[PDB]
Write a protein that binds this ligand. Structure first.
Ligand SMILES: Cc1cncc(NCc2ccncc2)c1
Length: 460
């Protein structure tokens, strides 16, 4: 029975509005409704992994797991295995997988982050799960960010706190946050970003939605505009939105958006908005394709509609050779030529690099770089030809070309990372000098870039 090269992953996000679900929710898991929907001919084909994010979830874990499992069993005739479930207040994540995957899944981690302080600490935050699927690391974040049209900067702050403090994945990757720890990271939830148009335009917006004309609304979507301005979700992707706003509906129908200010809303307007979102970030040159992104039309217990997204994701096998794991494979090496880091910092410490990769027995520390003053005031840290030669555990090109090197640039004075990035070994050639590049981020904000050349030697 061969190991898979690709799996499909279902991501769902639903703010349940503190109400129990209706008796049938299969349309969610089938990617049926509005937007980019799944072909009917696939209805009986199970996804490999289902990741369900809820917000304002009133059910117990037991209650929701029985609904989810019975739903999937009705669709597929498969009894899914529970990988992980984690709940913070009313924010929940469930991961289910086909039983055949049980002995492919390991290193399961869960964590949560509570956002805010005093007044704003006690219901918003995030839950997440990570695990290894054979040779591939997967991370999943369900966040419920701050509500309200005039709180986009709070949402951006909530995002930064979640990616700084959520402790998932390999703890040896100590300079790296969740935006660098996983081959594939999916971040979804009630992100709560709104369509920023004047309150007076509510009925105009409703009109546009009835005509399925979303362009003039999406051009004012706060998540799209903040992403464009590099204020949040830097280096994440989102599929084009082709479904109506998923909030705020009158319950028990989808015929009416309830936008007007009421005592129950704190006298705030809730103009129709795409609160409910799925984004992803995968390592460079790894296969990831969004197959569906949409909302259901027939699940009406909440003031939000459920959102679905599905992906075809590249995975790799748990490689064994005669040599690695547990020794090096002299026949492999990774070399770096003409490398330099450019950093936005005003600081003047010396810097060194750390190279982290599961193709190495342990991380590798470089010598200090040579600081130069760049022509437009920036800091250039030159490594030239001084970087160590990295010694992978396995030299087989079928393994090595699928790997990645994480890079941290650290201060010699504090050993704090000033920037993190990632280089793919999926090169156009071996034994050949080729350009490499990554942006560098810290706390998920841009701090610089690293570029140079690489030369990869495999056993072939
Ligand atoms: C509008 C916007 C927001 N955030 C990032 C970008 N980058 C360009 C891009 C990103 C994905 N795929 C193709 C092109 C663009």
């Amino acid at each position: 029975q061969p190991e898979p090269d690709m799996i499909t992953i279902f991501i769902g996000t639903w703010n349940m509005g503190n109400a129990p679900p209706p008796k049938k929710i299969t349309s969610w898991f089938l990617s049926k409704g509005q937007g980019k929907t799944r072909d009917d001919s696939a209805d009986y084909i199970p996804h490999d992994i289902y990741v369900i994010g809820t917000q304002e979830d009133p059910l117990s874990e037991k209650e929701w797991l029985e609904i989810l499992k019975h739903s999937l069993q009705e669709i597929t005739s498969v009894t899914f295995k529970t990988v992980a479930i984690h709940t913070l207040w009313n924010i929940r994540i469930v991961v289910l997988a086909k039983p055949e995957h049980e002995n492919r899944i390991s290193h399961i981690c869960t964590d949560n982050v509570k956002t805010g302080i005093a007044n704003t600490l006690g219901n918003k935050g995030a839950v997440g799960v990570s695990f290894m699927f054979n040779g591939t690391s997967l991370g999943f974040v369900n966040s419920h960010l701050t509500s309200g049209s005039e709180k986009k900067l709070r949402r951006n702050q909530n995002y930064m706190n979640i990616l700084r403090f959520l402790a998932l994945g390999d703890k040896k990757l100590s300079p790296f946050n969740i935006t660098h720890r996983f081959t594939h990271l999916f971040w979804f939830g009630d992100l709560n970003y709104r369509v920023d148009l004047p309150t007076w335009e509510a009925e105009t917006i409703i009109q546009k939605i009835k005509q399925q004309q979303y362009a003039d609304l999406l051009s004012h979507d706060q998540l799209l505009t903040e992403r464009r301005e590099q204020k949040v979700f830097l280096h994440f992707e989102e599929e084009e939105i082709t479904f109506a706003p998923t909030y705020r509906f009158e319950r028990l129908t989808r015929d009416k958006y309830a936008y007007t200010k009421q005592k129950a809303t704190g006298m705030k307007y809730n103009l129709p908005s795409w609160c409910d979102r799925v984004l992803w970030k995968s390592y460079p040159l790894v296969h990831v394709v969004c197959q569906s992104y949409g909302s259901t039309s027939d699940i009406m217990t909440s003031d939000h509609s459920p959102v679905f997204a599905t992906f075809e994701a590249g995975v790799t096998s748990q490689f064994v050779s005669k040599n690695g794991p547990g020794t090096v494979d002299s026949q492999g090496q990774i070399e770096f030529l003409r490398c330099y880091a450019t950093l936005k910092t005003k600081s003047q410490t010396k810097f060194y690099l750390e190279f982290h990769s599961s193709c190495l027995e342990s991380f590798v520390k470089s010598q200090e770089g040579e600081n130069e003053e760049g022509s437009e005031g920036e800091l250039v840290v030159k490594f030239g030809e001084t970087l160590p030669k990295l010694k992978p555990i396995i030299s087989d090109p079928e393994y090595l070309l699928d790997q990645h090197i994480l890079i941290s640039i650290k201060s010699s004075d504090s050993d704090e990372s000033y920037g993190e990035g990632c280089i793919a070994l999926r090169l156009e050639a071996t034994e050949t000098q080729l350009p490499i590049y990554t942006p560098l981020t810290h706390h998920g904000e841009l701090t610089g870039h690293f570029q140079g050349e690489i030369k990869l030697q495999t056993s072939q």
